[PDB]
């Protein structure tokens, strides 16, 4: 009669590493490193993302003609841009504090596209119809941004603007505008009166005076001039004012928004599909709960810590050594 | 005759966790996590903090009329602000590089209020008695900042201002000033009989020209204009020159200071007491030698690292089981 | 022992045996479950103690903010190097600790048998016992359970030790 003291073995081929020995085969192991993903972009925290497709963020927030078909959700957890994201701005220029604006419109708890200054009421003394350019035609028609309008002289007259907005909404309001920089003085006079123009924009916290910078620029698109873009947040109950005698591009639409916990922007060509996850990566949604992954490290959400290892496995069995 | 070997047990109630077992009983344990504090703010590294009580950094360093009751410390380790520290830039405007000023002033080994431009002799061609406003009156009467003088026209004229200072101190001198931005051109003409005006300030490192931006802003504290604030550090042996034709708010006092690279700014309503500590948190001074704390993520001085753990008792004793 | 048992249907540890009533692996279910509970607590401590927070990794910077972009990259690379080194080192150390734990568990069952049999069996040297007693299924079941009435069996063990 024999009594043998030993341990279980199986046909498992999963191995683990130790400080004293590598490639140790074990009967069971638990993988701490996720190397698989959904391959799809999905909802984060139960809320769908805002997918811009071919449009850039500047394009969407400015209402670029190529973004007319892009429906805006009342809320989103993050923004998705494609690898060919283009048609952001059209009249070329420097979008001021663009990265900060992209950071602010990351995760938004509420987002309503609100009309701040109706086209046919707010500017009875200026022409809101001829403000178009060939930089962004719509079906070749020479169009312009949908959220902003470019005012020009009516009858060789450009009276001073004193339009303001009282922000009677209960949420912060994002107001966008820009400054036009004609190629030469002749274009400043052709487009606007009061060639020695100025623009003033401000709120209780923010105020700044702008001047046109008239000079011939390198050609971009087909117009040797520039359009600088600005934005500001208006606190609930605060008043935002716009004053100008010349090169002011005024908002027509503005966005009333309540911001959520900080999120970010995913650059990816992967299509968007319906799923429910807690962290979304540009390469695809992560479905795991493990502490580490080897998936591309600019993820958004409650994601595990990126590790460059090809495998992380903890042993939970015994040496699988038959004999 | 029987002898036995065993191990110590006692009436201990302190428990520990392990990777293999949870809630084990230990005869004695050393708590590595500090969860207690004095509940009072105290001296850091043997030097008392500057306690502002009610004042903001802008208020104290500019000399807000409601901030005159604070003492002037020769040195401080850190600065304490209350949650009600709204007494700051009483005349609305953009304080330029305000966060940098707060960082620079967070820890000073030697600090003195020095009169840089004597009130009765430095501006014989300008009116230094007016310039009091309703934005921050004192005892119901119009007043202005203690450390700044808002110069206005002597009477139907604003003579050219050109005043330099040579830094004869052995320490760096912090010089503050501001620029006034009237609401309308009538306000500019009333205060400064110069119409278009400019301000120039410079040192051996700093050189900048300012131009008034006249425009109507939203009304804040009954004011329609704005006053921007500027500052610079003059190295010993250098000089600062203030050249202006109007819209310049000139210093009266400047601060001689020897800067450290230590503490930060604590915003807390905790009272100040006398203690010998090395670490200060908004909730109170910490007296501990332990490697970890769960008291507050915002820490000043040579303190343990903040963790989210609620229990890190080290099982320094023996397993305590009855028999 | 020479190696593990590929013919055992369950458990991690056991008492493979052969006697006049047959043979089998007789898995040790109580010590296996105790090992399972402690290893389960270990893996859950490694996984669940990661206090992953909701945060966004990656920031957009302009062409005149290169030092900040390099600071962000420095932070991401430093955290990646710390988490890669600590995660990989933790895996190797924890696996050495886990396999040493399991080997000590087999040693613990062997030691249990040694204390229970009290020289009523001899050691072969590869983790096995050769019984002096003709040890039937009830005998072995009692040994597996941890109960062994040494003084009634010791008379036969003594005679068999005299015989060798």
């Amino acid at each position, epitope marked *: 009669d024999t009594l043998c003291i030993g341990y279980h073995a199986n046909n498992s081929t999963d191995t683990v590493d130790t400080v004293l020995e590598k490639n140790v085969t074990v009967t*069971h192991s*638990v993988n701490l490193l996720e190397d698989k993903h959904n391959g799809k972009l999905c909802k984060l925290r139960g809320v769908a993302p805002l997918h811009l497709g071919k449009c850039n963020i500047a394009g969407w927030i400015l209402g670029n003609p190529e973004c007319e078909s892009l429906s805006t959700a009342s809320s989103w957890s993050y923004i998705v841009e494609t690898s060919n994201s283009d048609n952001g701005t059209c009249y070329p220029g420097d979008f001021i504090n663009y990265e900060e604006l992209r950071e602010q419109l990351s995760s938004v708890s509420s987002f309503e596209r609100f009309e701040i200054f109706p086209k046919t009421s707010s500017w009875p003394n200026h022409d809101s119809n001829k403000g178009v350019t060939a930089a962004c035609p719509h079906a070749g028609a020479k169009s312009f941004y949908k959220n902003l309008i470019w005012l020009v002289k009516k009858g060789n007259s450009y009276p001073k603007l004193n339009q303001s907005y009282i922000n009677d909404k209960g949420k912060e309001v994002l107001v966008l505008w820009g400054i036009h920089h004609p190629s030469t003085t002749a274009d400043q006079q052709s487009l606007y009166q009061n060639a020695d123009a100025y623009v003033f924009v401000g709120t209780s916290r923010y105020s700044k005076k702008f001047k046109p910078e008239i000079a011939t620029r390198p050609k971009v698109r087909d117009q040797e001039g520039r359009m600088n873009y600005y934005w500001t947040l208006v606190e609930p109950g605060d008043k935002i004012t716009f004053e100008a005698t010349g090169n002011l591009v005024v908002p027509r639409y503005a966005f009333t928004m309540e911001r959520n916990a900080g999120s970010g922007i995913i650059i990816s060509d992967t299509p968007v599909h319906d799923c429910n996850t807690t962290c979304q990566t540009p390469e695809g949604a992560i479905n795991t709960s493990l502490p580490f992954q080897n998936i591309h490290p600019i993820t958004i959400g409650k994601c595990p810590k990126y590790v460059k290892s090809t495998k992380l496995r903890l042993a*939970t069995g015994l040496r699988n050594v038959p004999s | 005759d029987t002898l036995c070997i065993g191990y110590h047990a006692n009436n201990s109630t302190d428990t520990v966790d392990t990777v293999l077992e*949870k*809630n084990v009983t230990v005869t004695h344990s050393v708590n590595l996590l500090e969860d207690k504090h004095n509940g009072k703010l105290c001296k850091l590294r043997g030097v008392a903090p500057l306690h502002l009580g009610k004042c903001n950094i802008a208020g104290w360093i500019l000399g807000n009329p409601e901030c005159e009751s604070l003492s002037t410390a020769s040195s401080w380790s850190y600065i304490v602000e209350t949650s009600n520290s709204d007494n700051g830039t009483c005349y609305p405007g953009d304080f330029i590089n305000y966060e940098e000023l707060r960082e620079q002033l967070s820890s000073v080994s030697s600090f003195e209020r020095f009169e840089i431009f004597p009130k009765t002799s430095s501006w014989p061609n300008h009116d230094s008695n007016k310039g009091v406003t309703a934005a921050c009156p004192h005892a119901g009467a119009k007043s202005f900042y203690k450390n700044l003088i808002w110069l206005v026209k002597k009477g139907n004229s604003y003579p050219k201002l050109n005043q330099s200072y040579i830094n004869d101190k052995g320490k760096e001198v912090l010089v503050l000033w501001g620029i006034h931005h009237p609401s309308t051109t009538a306000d500019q003409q009333s205060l400064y009989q110069n119409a278009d005006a400019y301000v120039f300030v410079g040192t051996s490192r700093y050189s900048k020209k300012f131009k008034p931006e006249i425009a109507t802003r939203p009304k804040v504290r009954d004011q329609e204009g704005r006053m921007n604030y500027y500052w610079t550090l003059v190295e010993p042996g250098d000089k600062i020159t203030f050249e202006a034709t109007g819209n310049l708010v000139v210093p009266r006092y400047a601060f001689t200071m020897e800067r450290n690279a230590g503490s930060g700014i604590i915003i807390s309503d905790t009272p100040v007491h006398d203690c010998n500590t090395t670490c200060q948190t908004p909730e109170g001074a910490i007296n501990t030698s332990l490697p970890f704390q769960n008291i507050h993520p915002i820490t000043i001085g040579k303190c343990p690292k903040y963790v989210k753990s*609620t229990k890190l008792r080290l099982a320094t004793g023996l397993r305590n089981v009855p028999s | 022992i020479e190696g593990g048992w590929t013919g055992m249907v*369950d458990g991690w540890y056991g008492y493979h045996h052969q006697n006049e009533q047959g043979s089998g692996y007789a898995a040790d*279910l*109580k010590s296996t*479950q105790n090992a*399972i509970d402690k*290893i*389960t607590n270990k*893996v*859950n401590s490694v*996984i*669940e103690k990661m206090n992953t927070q909701f945060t966004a990794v990656g920031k957009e910077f302009n062409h005149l903010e290169k030092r900040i972009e390099n600071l962000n990259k420095k932070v991401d690379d430093g955290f990646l190097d710390i988490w890669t080194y600590n995660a990989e080192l933790l895996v190797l150390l924890e696996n050495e600790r886990t396999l040493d734990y399991h080997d000590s568990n087999v040693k613990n069952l062997y030691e249990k048998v040694r204390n229970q049999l009290k020289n009523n069996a001899k050691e072969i040297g590869n983790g096995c016992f050769e019984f002096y007693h003709k040890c039937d299924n009830t005998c072995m079941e009692s040994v597996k359970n941890g109960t062994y009435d040494y003084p009634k069996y010791s008379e036969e063990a003594k005679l068999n030790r005299e015989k060798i």
Partner: antibody
Amino acid sequence: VQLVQSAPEVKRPGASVRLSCKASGYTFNTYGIIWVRQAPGQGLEWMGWISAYTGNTNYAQKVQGRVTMTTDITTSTAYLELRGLRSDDTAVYYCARGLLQGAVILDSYHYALDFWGQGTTVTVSS
Amino acid sequence: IVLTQSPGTLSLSPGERATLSCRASQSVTNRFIAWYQHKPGQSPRLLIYGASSRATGIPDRFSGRGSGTDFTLTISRLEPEDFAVYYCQQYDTSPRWTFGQGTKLEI
């Protein structure tokens, strides 16, 4: 899936009772059986625990000494015994599946109870 | 083990949404909280395990989340079949389970 309980038992105050529950589509040796008492003022009271692997049990702290349990693979039943009862112990005594008991638990499903039984009642009111 | 169901009674019509808050005295890991439904006349059925995971075979109408000492069960629509009683379950490392008392559900 769906454990089997049948034949309600009615006895007398001050006398022992026996309860049973049979496994459905399982191997029996990968889980335990836990009982929950349903009564007008208790709601759900965790009574009993067993593991069909080790034979170990945590009874219940306030009832130790009044309940005995042992497994029997041959007929697949919990085979509960209850003795020294009064009359306040009348309850449904639902049967449920407990811990995995045999593999590392990486899924919270193996702590939560599921696949409750049919709820055969016991009445001791005579 | 202390489990408290705060609202006591929830009386809401079908088509609305409601929550049940279960407070624990001891902070525990999320792995040990489960939510159950008890329709009178039948046996309890599992709704949620691990404080968030969906039970096998249940519609998306039932959800929940929680942490620390405060866990919430969220019921959407509140169909006639939902007006029963809910129990909060807690496990604490050792093989010890408890249930709460639940709340009354009324139209």
